[PDB]
Design a protein around this nucleic acid. Structure first.
Lengths: 149, 58
RNA sequence: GCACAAGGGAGCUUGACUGCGAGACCUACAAGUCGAGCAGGGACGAAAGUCGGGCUUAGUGAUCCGGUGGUUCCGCAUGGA
RNA sequence: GAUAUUGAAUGUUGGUACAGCUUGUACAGGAUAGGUAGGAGCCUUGGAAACCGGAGCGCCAGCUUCGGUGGAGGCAUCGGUGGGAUACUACCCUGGCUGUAUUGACCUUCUAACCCACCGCCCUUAUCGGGCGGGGAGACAGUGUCAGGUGGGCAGUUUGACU
RNA sequence: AGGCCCAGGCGACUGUUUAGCAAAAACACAGGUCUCUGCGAAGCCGUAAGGCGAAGUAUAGGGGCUGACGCCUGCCCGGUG
RNA sequence: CGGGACCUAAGCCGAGGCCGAAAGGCGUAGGCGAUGGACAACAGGUUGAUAUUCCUGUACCACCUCCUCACCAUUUGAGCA
RNA sequence: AAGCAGAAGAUGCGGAGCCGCAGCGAAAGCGAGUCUGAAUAGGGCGCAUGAGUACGUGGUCGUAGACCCGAAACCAGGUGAUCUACCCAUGUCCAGGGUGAAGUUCAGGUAACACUGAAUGGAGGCCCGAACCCACGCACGUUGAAAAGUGCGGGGAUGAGGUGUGGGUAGGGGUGAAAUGCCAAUCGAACCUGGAGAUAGCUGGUUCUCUCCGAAAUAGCUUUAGGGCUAGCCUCAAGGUAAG
RNA sequence: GUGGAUCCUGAGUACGGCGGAACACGUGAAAUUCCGUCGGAAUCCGGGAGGACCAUCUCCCAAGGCUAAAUACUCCCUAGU
RNA sequence: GAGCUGUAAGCAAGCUUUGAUCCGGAGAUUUCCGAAUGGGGAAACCCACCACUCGUAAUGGAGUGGUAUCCAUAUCUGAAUUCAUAGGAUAUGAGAAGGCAGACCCGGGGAACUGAAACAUCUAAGUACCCGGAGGAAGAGAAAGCAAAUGCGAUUCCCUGAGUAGCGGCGAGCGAAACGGGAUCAGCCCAAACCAAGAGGCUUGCCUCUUGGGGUUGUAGGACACUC
């Protein structure tokens, strides 16, 4: 008979991998182990409800996130840092410094892992910092640094 | 000896061989002693296979 | 019983046909046998006339149930099957 | 022996939903021509000619293919063939292969059900059984259906008449 | 309250049997032999549970044949199991 | 005294329970079941019928105080089992 | 007819329904014609030579037991192990005498037990023989005293033994040292009640009188030969009527 | 009473293969129904029946349930034949 | 309304016009066994527990009531196993076992003799018998029916159809239906869909679970909207 799998059959099937499972063995194994549940109207409707709920939740989470994140990321942000003779910067503003800047200036609250910068800016100028806002969408951040005192 | 769910029991009938002899015969029921929660608890009583498929839970 | 050939032979042929059948023998019944003659086509023979198996008597057994061919037949409402 | 109780695999042989493509001459012929439409053009350093190995086919005519060296030319309407012209879209299943999921069967190992006339506890002063917990096998066996073989162990009968 | 002896047949012996015709050369017997059975033995009773085997475990338990003891059980596995 | 207010074997009955068209069969616990086990009376007479049952003597078994008595103990506390 | 009203009735209603008047052909179908057949032919079945219907008596027939008695046997449901066969639990009985095993002790004796002889020994499905049990040879009984005995002798008589009490095996079965033996005087399949008034091609019996007539023991067939059908022979009634 | 935007009208069942039974019907071409196995539908734009089966037509909505009346019998009572 | 205490003679003794015997209606009592029910049981027998009562100085003894099993409700417990269950204890229960009449009826088993001149299909016959249930009747019953016409409209039973169709070693034998005419006369509820309330599951905004409102039909009906 038909069942709504709760875990892996040949791979995690929590999504409700409807199949035909040898009613005898199906009942015995799935019920003794909870591997699945009967595929009746009630359970099917409950699964559909939970699935659409989570789908819309994720859709909203991604939509709300991408839009304003990109829009604001299209802004300009600047800071100050001392520099020496010959353009040899005394330090380097890593991702942590940029995170602190965006947290204290504009209150963007982006993770230090989602926003990464390995090159370790050492120049006294402007630069665009890409961000991993979305696995399929990204935006740049116009960071700036200038001499101080 | 009968299915608890439906009135399935041992019936009787003839056994007509070649020449149409009329030896008497019995007809059993394909019932098994599986665990079912007919009442508030399981009891492990007899139940017919035809009724077991897509019917009461074991 | 057959030499007037029913026995020998030579030619053409398939009447070793189809529907029948007045009237008779035998028989408890079933059944069996002879049959002039009518019609449709024919064969032989110029014609007449013969041919509905062997010169005559044994060479075969029913009903039911099955199979094949033909049917102005019937065909569980109607038309088919 | 088949089926329900009674399924999971590892490989395995057909068919499905996705996919991979190739087989084609009676002769005429430069040849290997199946046609019906679009057809005056196509591939060329994302490389000609030639060269060689392997895969395939075959009406043993030969073709194609792919692996690559060598490298600037090859192909085509048009000249002739004959029933029908060669560059791109397709089919007719004539012809062989590999991958994913089901699909059903064959032969392999596991365990879930089924058993327990194996035990420990409780029900319970109980050598019945029945719930729990371990072990043993285990899709077996037992059980209900259908079929085949054997079956005087058993049952109902028959075994003529004249003389 | 025993008749005995000589000689042979049958059965090793004691025992059991056709109440109500036959007490025996018949039956059984201890012995031998073949065969089945690895334990939920096999066989048996019963439609099934449940029981005999057996509070047994291949020197133990069932089935057939022959019947102590001395010598031997010879050939044929074509036919049927 | 023979048996019942004492026990138990074979065997039967048998809550629950296991089986099985029905009826019903099997069986746990439990209980029945002597033909067994344990148990306190014996000696002389009496009438026409009864008598180790009646009469006359000596006795025994189980149990309770209205009393009787001596013992211990009333919480390493007598006593019962 | 059922049915309705009606004294359990007669009667009235009730034409639902059945038979005949038209038959032939399997059927379509046709019609005093129809079927067969190619066919106005021939032949088969009918009219043209119309009389049936509903009751009552009587004869006969078929179904019910069907003329009366008679089986052996079969099936179903029940009763029986108080007789007998076996088994289980628990008790009880076997008067007396003889034999003498194994073993044990001693003596002899061998290097050593082997071996021999004496003393105790009381084993035996042992012997003789009472009670008890079984009946094997002969007589009487066989309308007996007795629906299986008595009289004399006979075998066993401490292990397969006899026996009391209680219990189990119930018939398509049980039991059986095994004879077709026992299972309540019955057993090659116990007894009681039902199917059941089983069936009988078999035997026996079948009740008042007179009168008219008057046979057969033959052919065919037959799972049939002592049975049954047809025909042959008999009788009764109506016709042809003078055919024999 | 009016509309067919949309929803319902009795599922492991109607049926089918296998082995039987009863319907007058004996597996015969065998409808219809009940049975024990396995397979298993539509559900109104639908389904069942009209003696195999198919199309048209005709009739009706199963797999839910109840229902007195005319009908059979007399052990017994009252009265009478 | 004047003989009666039986059959049944009596011998004896008593009741009755304040009204007997007798007849009918409704009641009280009803030893023991028996489904038998506290346990056992060789039917009419024996042995107990708990309460109340009689009596002894106590036991001993005696009178009344309750004390079987299954099943329904409820309450307290509730082991393996932690909750929980199986199970155990308690109160309510004109609940229930049994035959009956040797009959009628619904269903489950289920023969043989017999007939076919044997006999196996068949008949005997779903007969006898056995089993389980109730009723005065039971079963069936309002068309997923008959039927083929300007068509009837729940079942049941009677006469016809009819010993016709048909079944059958196509034998023996078995055996209808509908139309038609009669006896009676009654049609109804549930599920499904939708709606009100609540409960649990969170099927997390959806699901089923329970009472109620609802509607029941083939010219299709109902829900839904509306007219009533």
């Amino acid at each position: 008979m038909k069942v709504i799998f709760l875990q892996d059959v040949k791979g995690k099937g929590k999504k409700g991998e409807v199949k035909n499972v040898a009613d005898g063995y199906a009942h015995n194994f799935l019920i003794k182990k909870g591997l699945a549940v009967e595929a009746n109207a009630s359970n099917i409707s409950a699964l559909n409800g939970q699935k659409q709920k989570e789908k819309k939740e994720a859709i909203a989470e991604l939509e709300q996130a991408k839009s304003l994140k990109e829009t604001l990321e299209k802004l300009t942000v600047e800071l100050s840092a001392k520099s020496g003779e010959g353009g040899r910067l005394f330090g380097s503003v890593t991702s942590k410094q940029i995170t602190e800047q965006l947290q204290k200036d504009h209150n963007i609250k982006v993770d230090k892992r989602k926003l990464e910068l390995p090159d370790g800016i050492r120049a006294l100028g402007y630069t665009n910092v890409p961000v991993k806002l979305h696995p399929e969408v990204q935006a740049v951040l116009k960071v700036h640094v200038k001499e101080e005192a | 000896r009968k299915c608890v769910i439906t009135g399935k029991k041992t019936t009787a009938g003839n056994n007509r061989s070649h020449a149409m002899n009329a030896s008497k015969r019995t007809w059993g029921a394909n019932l098994q002693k599986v665990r079912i929660l007919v009442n508030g608890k399981p009891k492990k009583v007899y139940v017919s296979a035809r009724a077991l498929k897509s019917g009461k839970v074991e």
